[PDB]
Amino acid sequence: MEDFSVSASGLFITNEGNFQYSNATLSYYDPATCEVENEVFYRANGFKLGDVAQSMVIRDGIGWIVVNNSHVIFAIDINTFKEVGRITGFTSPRYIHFLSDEKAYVTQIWDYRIFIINPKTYEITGYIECPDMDMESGSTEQMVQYGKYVYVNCWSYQNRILKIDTETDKVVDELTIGIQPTSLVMDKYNKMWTITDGGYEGSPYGYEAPSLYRIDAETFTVEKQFKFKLGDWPSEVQLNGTRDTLYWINNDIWRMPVEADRVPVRPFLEFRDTKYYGLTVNPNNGEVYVADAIDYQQQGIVYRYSPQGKLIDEFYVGIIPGAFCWKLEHHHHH
Ligand code: CNC
Ligand SMILES: [Cl-]
């Protein structure tokens, strides 16, 4: 076991590792020193994260790491990386969304329910049943808040956004769109963005040209749709800190102002026959980080770009780096 006491400002990278090989890891990058630290959860705690580290949220000095195929969320000190607690019993957890210190939602694959937890006591307290959904093909994924409502995309073998009333913990509406919306963000106009992966060739569920959608939160209606090419396998809508510039992965890294009527001809970062897989925008300074899985086998590489697309830095992370979590001392945005 190793003692860490890292920067007040930094960047976590979760590494999924290889599904069913239990080689998921956590990386910590200091943008001021341009130094990366790899395998920091193992190094700090003396045991493995597990299988498919999916996502991470930082709240009140604690990092909540979702380990999808280990049925657990780890709570860590964001400075020492030491575990302060864990929640077990998740079917196959995906994303955590906090409503309070005592209430959060945890989405699942292979379950038709969203888990309700108490992060304070580290307990599962209840379940939200998704309509028209079973265990065999169930999927809830990313979440955004809109007043008293949480919106959630249904990804694997699903084609819906659900609306949850957080005051009753019930799904109160749904919207059917293209198959397998991957990810969900809310822009500063309270308009949601989601991008579909289009399924895959030979899928028992579907295989189609994928789309990027803008969905008004108030009317819960599609306002814009940008359809791509059959065989495209897009992912990971991401916003800048002012929530007026959208990024996503579709071979290339794409950038579009949220009020645009057309996807720009030119991508932010050109495809280079690798596997762009993870994406984030520094919420304070607009710097763009691209996690490249390369070939899903070797150590991944993160590329750090200026908001104008000029390379700043590049560093190795773990295998299949999938997600980022910002550790910021101050947020410039409200
Ligand atoms: C590439 C890939 C990946 N996939 Co697929 C995705 N997205 N996937 C695919 C594709 C594989 C073929 C291709 N076009 O390249 C593709 C699009 C067909 C696919 C399909 C699926 N995938 C699916 C899921 C959910 C997953 N996939 C990942 C394994 C997920 C991977 C991410 C990860 N962290 O592992 C992943 C990004 C990289 C796998 C890889 O090539 N590794 C390198 C390779 C050398 O190692 P490998 O051990 O031989 O990998 C093989 C397996 O991973 C297998 N496989 C891939 N996905 C699954 C899912 C399941 C349930 C099973 C049993 C096997 C697989 O295919 C690979 C090629 O043989 C996953 C961990 C991503 C995630 N972070 O959630 C996740 C499984 C989570 C879980 N707890 O079950 C689908 C259910 C998604 C969907 N509804 O479209 C579906 C299931 C197919 C099935 N039942 O076999
Ligand atoms: Cl680790």
Residue numbers in the entry: 40 to 373
Quote the authors verbatim.
Contrasting with Enterobacteria, members of the dominant genus Bacteroides often encode several BtuB vitamin B12 outer membrane transporters together with a conserved array of surface-exposed B12-binding lipoproteins. Here we show that the BtuB transporters from Bacteroides thetaiotaomicron form stable, pedal bin-like complexes with surface-exposed BtuG lipoprotein lids, which bind B12 with high affinities. Closing of the BtuG lid following B12 capture causes destabilisation of the bound B12 by a conserved BtuB extracellular loop, causing translocation of the vitamin to BtuB and subsequent transport. We propose that TonB-dependent, lipoprotein-assisted small molecule uptake is a general feature of Bacteroides spp. that is important for the success of this genus in colonising the human gut.
As observed previously, CNCbl binds to BtuG2 with very high affinity. The BtuG2-CNCbl complex is extremely stable, given that a boiled sample run on a denaturing SDS-PAGE gel shows a visible pink band around 40 kDa, suggesting that some CNCbl is still bound to BtuG2. An initial BtuG2-CNCbl structure was solved to 1.9 Å resolution using cobalt-based single-wavelength anomalous diffraction (Co-SAD), showing unambiguous electron density for CNCbl. This model was used to solve an additional dataset at slightly higher resolution (1.7 Å). BtuG2 adopts a seven-bladed beta-propeller fold. The propeller blades define a central cavity that forms the B12 binding pocket with an interface area of 698 Å2 as measured via PISA22. CNCbl is oriented with the cyano group (upper ligand) pointing towards the protein centre while the lower ligand, present in its “base-on” conformation, is completely exposed to the exterior, with the nucleotide loop sitting in the cleft formed between blades 1 and 7. There are 13 hydrogen bonds between BtuG2 and CNCbl, all mediated by the amide groups of the substituents from side chains a, b, c and g of the corrin ring and involving protein residues from blades 1 to 4. CNCbl binding is further stabilised by Van der Waals forces provided by 11 residues, evenly distributed across the blades. The cavity that contains the cyano upper ligand is narrowed by Trp194, Trp272 and Tyr316 (numbering based on the annotated Uniprot sequence, including the signal peptide).
